[PDB]
Structures are given as structure tokens and as C-alpha cells.
Amino acid sequence: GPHMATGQDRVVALVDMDCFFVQVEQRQNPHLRNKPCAVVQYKSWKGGGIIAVSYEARAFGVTRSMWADDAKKLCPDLLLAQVRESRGKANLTKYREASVEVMEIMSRFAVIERASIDEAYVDLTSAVQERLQKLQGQPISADLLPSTYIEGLPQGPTVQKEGMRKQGLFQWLDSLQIDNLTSPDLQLTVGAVIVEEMRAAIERETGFQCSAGISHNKVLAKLACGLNKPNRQTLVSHGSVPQLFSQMPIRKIRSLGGKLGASVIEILGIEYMGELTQFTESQLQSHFGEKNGSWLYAMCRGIEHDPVKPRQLPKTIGCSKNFPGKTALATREQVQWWLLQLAQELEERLTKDRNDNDRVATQLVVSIRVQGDKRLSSLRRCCALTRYDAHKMSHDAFTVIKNCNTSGIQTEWSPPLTMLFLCATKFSAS
DNA sequence: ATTATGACGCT
DNA sequence: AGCGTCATA
Ligand SMILES: [Ca+2]
Ligand SMILES: [Mn+2]
Ligand SMILES: [Mn+2]
């Protein structure tokens, strides 16, 4: 009862850009705006691989991982933008730089955790406390929440989407106890006000639209964000969790989309997150381990303590290329030439990183895949990274992998290489 | 023949 | 350390 922790201590948001690489290309090229369009890498093989899709194109059934030739079968008027190619490979610099634009704006409001190229978590607990003091017990107007959905509302005793949104928001605001500076629901609401401001700032200063989730932890914030996309934000309260989770497939929760999630389903014979509540903590720990079990026991009740880490910059800088089917590398000079290409992009990114962010990478990680291996990586070896020089890094990379060549002939490489990967790690301040 | 990443857990 | 899992454009 009174000692039951409810995991309502924090206000956490997740902000995720809408169709991000597509918006970067649509900003650049006005002809692509408000059209079915997608972003593709490479072109020779089946028109290239789709990696981002506008909402207009999704309506035709176009998805990520689809070959553009196949996407065109669903959407004959689909417009395409190509990922840049440099040194023989896809180069994602434009999208990394656009990401920095957004992350720098978000950082003005609070400490952020960069979680991908297009999303960051925000711990708004302190910002909310500050804003609550400014508000002075004054009610929150619906006008301050013009793109916010309250999950689970409206309920109880109009037919268009925006109408429904306002109905739910009204019920929510009508219920709010604004006299209590410590009410979690009030704190979430003020959190949502700030995120409206954050999202307006991102759109004003970059042109990019985004969605967001506001809740008491990262998992719920992420889940909330996806509930009303694009260009909207969703508040998931603690109270909304039982109904929300009662029909929520387990795989939809972050970290449960893979083998662990499948094992939760199979071992326990359940389908929905809410069904987890009927197991003891020890029962869950017995099946899924101490850490996972405790996490599941709290998470199915809407509770999670994973902090928003203060980290705005990626921890590693990597360059990778696949060589599928017949393009697999079978000669030493092939292997060496491509290691050099990767190393040259890596040097360029590392040198920029050092100037921008006052740090230096100290370890070089080299990974390859061999033809036949089911695994994405076959072998991973590290060596020292002492100088930002591509010729040295590629020579060093070759040295640490050259023993994988089973071929009796030095000139030939066997089995052929279907992937190369260079990653700079272990940064130190500089 | 999705590809190019990037964080974190296990032993 | 090297490998595996899970994640996003
Ligand atoms: Ca996104
Ligand atoms: Mn994302
Ligand atoms: Mn996505």
C-alpha cells in the first residue's frame, strides 16, 4: 500500500523525428515535399534498398527494406532520393549532420540521451518543477497542448480524429488537480507542455517535424511516441498502463522484440504485457534471469528505473560495407583497397570529431564476415589506434585479419569476404 | 542481395 | 577480449 513504489518520480520524454531521412531530403529538395517518396541506397540491384519512407508512400504499402523496383510496383509515382556515395560506399554524413541540428536544439531544454540518429530521451523532472513554480497553481489551458493525445481518453458516458483528440484532452484537463505540485499526472501534463515547446522549436529552427512520448520512464515514453505518429505527441499516464498493457503484444516493448520476448511468450504461454502481472518476481527471475526477471516484474506494472544518460554524442565511430553474393572479396588487393576506402572515411569522420568534440579514439576494432556464415559478424579483432591516418589504420586492420585467409595462395582470399567493418572506440578527452 | 550503423549484455 | 542481442534510418 503506502510503501508500494509506483515509479512516478520522473518525467521522461522520447522525441523521434518523423520519416527522418525523407524529411532531410524534402527540406533540401522542395519538389519532394508532400509527395510519396523514399530514400534509397545504391541503385544497380533492384533499384536500390529503401531505408526511409514518407507517410504518403506508406499509404501505398511502401516499407523500409523493400527494393525500390518492388516499391514502384505498389506506388508507380514514388519519388526517390539517393544516399550519397563516396569512396565506393554509402555515406550517411548528411543525416548525421541533420541529427546534430536537432540534438543541439533539444539540449537547450534539458540533458538528453541520444538513442539513435533520429531520437533522444529527455529527463524533464527538473524543468517541470521549475515551470510549476512559474505557473503558480494556475490551470493548464488546452491551448498549450495543441498536438497532444492523452492515451486512454476520451472514455465513458464526434467522428473525426482531431475532435477525438480534443475530447480526450478536455476530460484529462477537467480532471487535473493543479493545486498539488507533487501530483504525477500534473507533472506529466507540464512535461507535455514543455515538449510542445521543444517540438515547435525543432520545427521552427530546422523545418523537421517529429513525434514524442511523455511518461514516467524511457520504455513508456518510447511506446507513447509511436501511438500517434506523425507530428503528434502522446502522454501515457501511470493510470493508463493497465488498459494499455492488457492488449499490448509483448514484442512491442523495447528490448522484448527479439528472442527474449519470444521466450516470454512461449514459456509462459501469454501474449500481452499485462498478463505478466500474474507471475511472482521470483517466477520471472527463474525463467529469464535475475536482471530480466526483476525488470519484467516492474515493467508490466509500468515501472522502470533506467536513467536518461547524459550522452549527446555517439560512443563509437564506425564504417562498414557488405559485399553480397558475387561481389564478395576474393583477392588480397581487393581486401586491401576496400580497407583503405573504409579507413579513409573513418579518418575523415574521426578528424572532424576531434575538432568538434575535444576527444580522441584510442582503439580500432576490425570485423569481417565470411561467405557462408549465418552470423552478421564472423570475426572481431582490436588493435591500437594511435594516429588518425587512414593508410596506417587500413594496414593495421589487414594485419589483424590477414590470418583468416585459408587460401594457400597469398594473392587469393578464401573464403571470400562478405563484410568489412572498421570501428573507432574508447575515446579519451583531448 | 536490405545495408549501415550504434549501445549494451555475457562470460 | 570477442561474441551475441536488440535496436534505428
Ligand atoms: Ca523516426
Ligand atoms: Mn527513431
Ligand atoms: Mn522507423
Residues with CB under 5 A from ligand 1 (ion): A 16-17, 20, 118
The residues of chain A that CATH labels 3.30.1490.100 are: 308-430
* Helix pair angle (A93-106, A184-206), 10° resolution: 130
Q: Which three cell numbers stand for residue A263?
A: 521466450
Q: What angle do CA A387, A389, A394 make, to 5 degrees?
A: 110
Q: Is the CB of A291 under 7 A from strand C?
A: no
Nucleotides of strand C lying closer than 7 angstroms to a protein CB = 1-9
Question: How many angstroms is C1' of C4 away from CA of A398?
Answer: 24
Q: Is the CB of A49 under 7 A from strand B?
A: yes
Q: What is the number of the ligand closest to the CA of A222?
A: 2
What are the angstrom distances between the C-alpha of A75 and each of A34, A36, A37, A45, A72? Answer: 15, 8, 9, 19, 5
Is it true that the peptide bond before A76 is cis, omega within 30 degrees of 0? no
CA distance A173 to A171: 6
Whether A118 has a binding-site annotation, put simply, is: yes
Q: Is the CB of A375 under 7 A from strand C?
A: yes
Reference A13, options A208, A184, A209, A188; nearest CA is: A188
The residues of chain A that CATH labels 3.40.1170.60 are: 19-88
* Helix pair angle (A390-401, A332-357), 10° resolution: 130
Which uninterrupted H or E stretch holds A211?
strand A210-215
Burial, A411: exposed, middle or buried (Cβ in 10 Å; 0-12, 13-18, 19+)? exposed
Reference A84, options A32, A26, A39, A46; nearest CA is: A39
**CATH node for A308-430:** 3.30.1490.100
Whether A151 has a binding-site annotation, put simply, is: no
**CATH node for A250-307:** 1.10.150.20
Residues in chain A: 430
- Nearest nucleic acid nucleotide to A371, CA to C1' distance: B1
Contact criterion met (CB below 8 Å) for A176 and A185: yes
Residues 6+ apart with CB under 8 A from A360: A354, A388, A427, A428, A430
Q: Is the CB of A200 under 7 A from strand C?
A: no
Residues 6+ apart with CB under 8 A from A61: A74, A75
Bridge partners of residue A40, in order along the sequence: A50, A82
Minimum-distance residue to B4 (CA–C1'):
A320
Residue A156 Cα to ligand 3 midpoint, Å, equals: 34
Question: How many angstroms is C1' of B6 away from CA of A218?
Answer: 18
Residues 6+ apart with CB under 8 A from A306: A217, A218, A219
Q: Is the CB of A317 under 7 A from strand B?
A: yes
Residue A99 Cα to ligand 1 midpoint, Å, equals: 11
Q: Is the CB of A384 under 7 A from strand C?
A: no
The residues of chain A that CATH labels 3.30.70.270 are: 1-18+89-249
Resolution, in Å, please? 1.6
What are the angstrom distances between the C-alpha of A107 and each of A11, A116, A285? Answer: 16, 15, 37
Question: How many angstroms is C1' of C5 away from CA of A390?
Answer: 31
The residues of chain A that CATH labels 1.10.150.20 are: 250-307
Minimum-distance residue to B2 (CA–C1'):
A65
Residue A175 Cα to ligand 1 midpoint, Å, equals: 32
CATH architecture of A1-18+89-249: 2-Layer Sandwich (3.30)
Whether A113 has a binding-site annotation, put simply, is: no
Q: Is the CB of A94 under 7 A from strand B?
A: no
Nucleotides of strand B lying closer than 7 angstroms to a protein CB = 1-10
At residue A337, φ and ψ (nearest 5 deg) are -65, -45
A17 residue type, one letter: M
At residue A122, φ and ψ (nearest 5 deg) are -130, 130
Q: Is the CB of A307 under 7 A from strand B?
A: no
Decide yes or no: CATH 3.40.50.10800 for domain A19-88. Answer: no
Q: What is the number of the ligand closest to the CA of A119?
A: 2
Minimum-distance residue to C8 (CA–C1'):
A116
Question: How many angstroms is C1' of C1 away from CA of A380?
Answer: 10
Whether A347 has a binding-site annotation, put simply, is: no
Whether A165 has a binding-site annotation, put simply, is: no
Q: Which residues of A412-429 are buried (b: 16+ CB within 10 A; e: fewer)?
A: ebebbbbbbbbbbeebee
